[PDB]
Design a protein around this ligand. Structure first.
Ligand SMILES: [Fe+3]
Ligand SMILES: [K+]
Ligand SMILES: [K+]
Ligand SMILES: [K+]
Lengths: 202, 202, 202
């Protein structure tokens, strides 16, 4: 019926209810407050999606035990509707082809219609899936790739329970034994002046 | 216009329609039933989010070929609205800062406003992304980490196509050859009483 | 109040507004057009979920600066409601137990009520979490598994900064040195006719 621009004073994260304060002068009082006023939540059965509505947020109140109904507007004496900013959206928060979950232009999960899935942050850290690959991207200079039935890591030092592999692909176990630098002591021979080469390992 | 508390008898997962039974006595009949009554779904274009509305669920019916409309309330002669429980929510299902996808307080995907993304279950299994790291957490005693352009695994035995690395960082290929335990047979020498040390590998 | 079947001519991805064209003849003009007409978006606070509403899409218009309100129906002179297809849904897009995010029957994120999380595409690429495991599935013939405090890869050639491990578990560093094939040159001995075996590495 009638509505007003409003500021979120406080939120009840259990009741799915907010406390609101008019930001403009109404019609005695001037800045009316509204208590235990509910808002729409997304869910059904045991599942749900929660959005970070918090004190300081702007929106609009509309009007004329234990819950809780997911769509309370029209059937409650009043409800709160967030008026979120979208005008400055880039192709990353809003797309023509992708389903995009995002928070504060900082965290993303995008699902494209062709088999590409991307979970990432603006800092460059990425978990990516394409029709034929899974790739983990470390913006710090590392990349793990599963593709074509092969696995690859390209980046810096690899560490497996102490065992180490350099950025250039040399390895040394936890004990210091290096595959390319190690030597063997040989027993029971005559100190000579010749040099022979051993066989491959046993 | 008017509404009633209701129980989901059955669901039509194709039509997005439910069969409902009044849980209280109405106003002849007593417990009226409602058929092929629709509900709100989240989606647009090719994308969508499905919630597990199922038989046994509680909600409220409101009233006075092929679909399907995402918001049918107000424009259909009747629609179903789930009345899901939220009063017992912890900071994990509902937050002031995070976008949280969850199911049955068992499965989670949280997106924080600072670059942190967490996909996990209550059992402790975790896939985590921060502004500078990707971490895989095995509640069974293992952790894989990509950070600073380096990759690390700390936990138990690592197995790569038969090749094995112990929890303490010793390795042995599929053939039994251990980097730290292997020996070489040496040919063409005089059995003596001295002992020399070989060079590094070729 | 009154509504019409409609086609999306164009979309304003910044304003959350569409341009619509009636697909049937109205009541002068015949095929009326509607401009800067808004639609419902999912969000609250800094968070949101964007769906790929695009030109060509079908839906229904209902009727009688900078935004933007998440639920504009009933309080705007008109709004757009997508009429998405769901009749052909498989158990993968709609479930009785799982929360499912999907796009175009191509990309999926499913959250089950028992601790199972699945992120995958129809091509078979999978990232899976269960109560006791994390598994990465490469439909090309590879599988990475974290479970029981152990990590395993079974598939083809593993590549770590040049260092290689065959599908059968043999390894060779970037320099060509193979753990099972390498040999050592031995200095200062008498060329003989005997053969001794060295000790383990130093
Ligand atoms: Fe050797
Ligand atoms: K390094
Ligand atoms: K172990
Ligand atoms: K291969």
């Amino acid at each position: 019926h009638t509505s007003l621009p409003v500021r979120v004073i406080g939120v009840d994260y259990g009741s799915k209810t907010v406390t609101l304060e008019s930001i403009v002068k109404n019609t005695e009082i001037d800045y009316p407050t509204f208590h235990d006023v509910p808002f729409m939540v997304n869910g059904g059965g045991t599942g749900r999606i929660s959005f970070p509505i918090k004190a300081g947020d702007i929106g609009v109140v509309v009007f004329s035990s234990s819950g809780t109904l997911i769509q309370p507007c029209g059937l409650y004496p009043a409800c709160f509707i967030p008026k979120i900013a979208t005008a400055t959206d880039s192709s990353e928060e809003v797309d023509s082809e992708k389903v995009i979950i995002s928070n504060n232009k900082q965290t993303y999960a995008s699902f494209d219609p062709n088999g590409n899935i991307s979970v990432y942050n603006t800092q460059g850290m990425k978990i990516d899936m394409t029709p034929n690959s899974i790739v983990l991207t470390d913006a710090g200079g590392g990349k793990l790739t599963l593709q074509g039935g092969t696995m690859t890591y390209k980046g810096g030092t690899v560490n497996l329970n102490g065992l180490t592999i350099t950025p250039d692909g040399r390895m040394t176990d936890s004990g210091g034994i290096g595959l390319h630098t190690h030597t063997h002591p040989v027993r029971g021979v005559e100190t000579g002046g010749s040099t022979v080469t051993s066989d491959k390992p046993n």
